[PDB]
């Protein structure tokens, strides 16, 4: 019968590795857009297909091409482990979401197109123009079986 | 209480309600009670009056 198991292996700090803190307004780095949280046709109890770290344009549509990259979805409603919002939204509803745009250090690996596929060089160049530092310098971690 | 599998929630106690139960008629104590043995009960009635006496 297998087993009922759940796993959580990620945090918010692993996507936005750091900011530039403004003195005039702490919201200088974020923009708010309206997004289709639950697909139009999916049943009310279907979980949302959005996952933290996806690249979304300024019009709320996840990017399937490098050109339509405007920001990284970092809303607190789609972070790893937050599964409560099931059936809480009418299918086809559009709900505001928070995008991070300017003045950030962004992890290369967690950025992903609408369909999970990693981002190319064109995407990196397009996103950097907003003033973000996409980096590959992550130490990582090793577990259990890896001798040290 | 936990939420999902990793978060927490605040619990705000229970809320309960019950429907009406009217006892106005019962409270007045109008009725009497008799306890017997069988399933068939009898009652008896007696009617009495008077007469118009004449002179003789």
CB pair distance less than 8 Å for A82 and B5? no
CB pair distance less than 8 Å for B5 and A81? yes
Q: In terms of C-beta density within 10 A (0-12 exposed, 13-18 middle, 19 or more buried), how is residue B4 classed?
A: middle
Bridging pattern class, strands A30-36 and A94-100: antiparallel
Element (H, E) at A94: strand A94-100
**C-alpha to C-alpha distance for B49 and A47, rounded to whole angstroms:** 90
Torsion of CA A60, A10, A83, A119, to 10 degrees: 30
- Please indicate if any CB of chain A lies within 8 Å of the CB of B19: no
Residue tagged 């933290």 (tokens) = A52
**C-alpha to C-alpha distance for A98 and A66, rounded to whole angstroms:** 20
CA distances from A92 to A66, A88, A96, B9 (A): 26, 12, 13, 28
CA distances from A130 to A53, A104, A111, A127, A135 (A): 16, 10, 15, 6, 15
Contact (CB, 8 A) for A74 and A12: yes
Identify the CA nearest to A20 among candidates A133, A99, A103: A103
> How far apart are the two ends of chain A, measured CA to CA in Å?
36
Experimental method for this entry?
A: cryo-EM
- Please indicate if any CB of chain B lies within 8 Å of the CB of A84: yes
Chain centroid to CA A69: how far? 12
CB pair distance less than 8 Å for A84 and B3? yes
CB pair distance less than 8 Å for B7 and A8? no
Chain B contacts of A82, Cβ < 8 Å?
A: 4, 7
Q: Can you name the residues that pair with B8 across neighbouring β-strands?
A: B2
Return the structure tokens found at A61. Answer: 């549509």
Dihedral sign for Cα A28, A88, A45, B16, please: positive
CB pair distance less than 8 Å for B4 and A8? no
Q: Which residues of A110-127 are buried (b: 16+ CB within 10 A; e: fewer)?
A: bbbbbeeeebeeebbebb
Give the gap in angstroms from C-alpha A27 to the nearest C-alpha of chain B. 26
- Please indicate if any CB of chain B lies within 8 Å of the CB of A87: no
> How far apart are the two ends of chain B, measured CA to CA in Å?
103
Resolution (A): 3.6
Identify the CA nearest to A117 among candidates A60, A66, A58: A66
């Amino acid at each position: 019968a297998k087993a009922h198991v759940a796993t959580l292996e990620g945090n918010y700090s692993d996507i936005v590795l750091g900011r530039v803190v403004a003195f005039g307004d702490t919201g200088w780095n974020f923009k708010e857009v309206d997004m289709t949280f639950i697909a139009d046709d999916a049943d009310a109890d279907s979980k949302t297909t959005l996952f933290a770290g996806v690249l979304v344009g300024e019009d709320g549509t996840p990017a399937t091409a490098a050109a339509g990259v405007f920001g990284v979805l970092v809303d607190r409603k789609v972070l790893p482990g937050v599964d409560h919002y099931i059936g809480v939204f009418e299918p086809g509803e559009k709900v505001p979401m928070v995008l991070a745009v300017r003045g950030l250090t962004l992890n290369q690996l967690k950025l992903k197109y609408a369909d999970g596929t990693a981002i190319d060089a064109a995407g990196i160049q397009a996103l950097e123009a907003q003033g973000n530092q996409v980096t590959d310098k992550i130490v990582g971690t090793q577990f259990i079986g890896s001798v040290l | 209480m936990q939420n999902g599998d990793f978060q927490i929630l605040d619990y705000t106690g229970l809320i309960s309600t019950m429907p009406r139960v009217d006892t106005l008629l019962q409270s007045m104590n109008l009725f009497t009670e008799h306890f017997g043995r069988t399933t068939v009960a009898r009652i008896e009635r007696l009617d009495d009056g008077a007469g118009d006496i004449k002179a003789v």
